[PDB]
Amino acid sequence: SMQEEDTFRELRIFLRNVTHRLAIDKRFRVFTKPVDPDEVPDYVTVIKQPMDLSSVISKIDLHKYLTVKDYLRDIDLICSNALEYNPDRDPGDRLIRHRACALRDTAYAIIKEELDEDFEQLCEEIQESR
Ligand SMILES: [Cl-]
């Protein structure tokens, strides 16, 4: 229905705002663009599902997210990809892991404070009805 389309449009507006807030934070600059195969030629071989905030904006605009749970699965991938690719005790890897965990925790904290649970439940029920 047009009412269900309005629901998904509100979801996209909400997810674009959350993603913009993460992308303008200087801590998360490394997560704003895909990894350059020049700097890192082994990345695309180790990480099977690369994800970054530019890709997340593209997915929002392609109507790939019908629930906040589907969005958070891609935020979780940004975090888990960084924990897997950068697992060493050296400060460079520790700094990327801390920044990836902070991204993920920030996204969840914004959603906990600003997403109505009844709005999420409505999205989940339209998605399940298709
Ligand atoms: Cl830095």
CATH value at residue 27: 1.20.920.10
Q: Contact 12/64 with Cβ under 8 angstroms?
A: no
* Residue range(s) defining the domain that contains residue 112: 1-130
Distance (angstroms) between ligand 1 centre and the Cα of 93 equals 12
User: 103 and 75 in contact (C-beta within 8 Å)?
Assistant: yes
How many domains in the chain?
A: 1
Resolution in A: 1.5
- 90-94: long-range contacts (C-beta < 8 A, 24 or more apart)? none
b/e 46-85 (16+ beta carbons within 10 angstroms → b): ebeeebbbeebbebbeeeebbbbebbbebbebbbebbeeb
Which of these, 130, 124, 83, lies nearest to 104 by C-alpha position?
83
Between the CA of 15 and the centroid of ligand 1 the distance, in Å, is 26
Q: State the method.
A: X-ray
Residue 33 to residue 40: CA distance in whole angstroms = 13
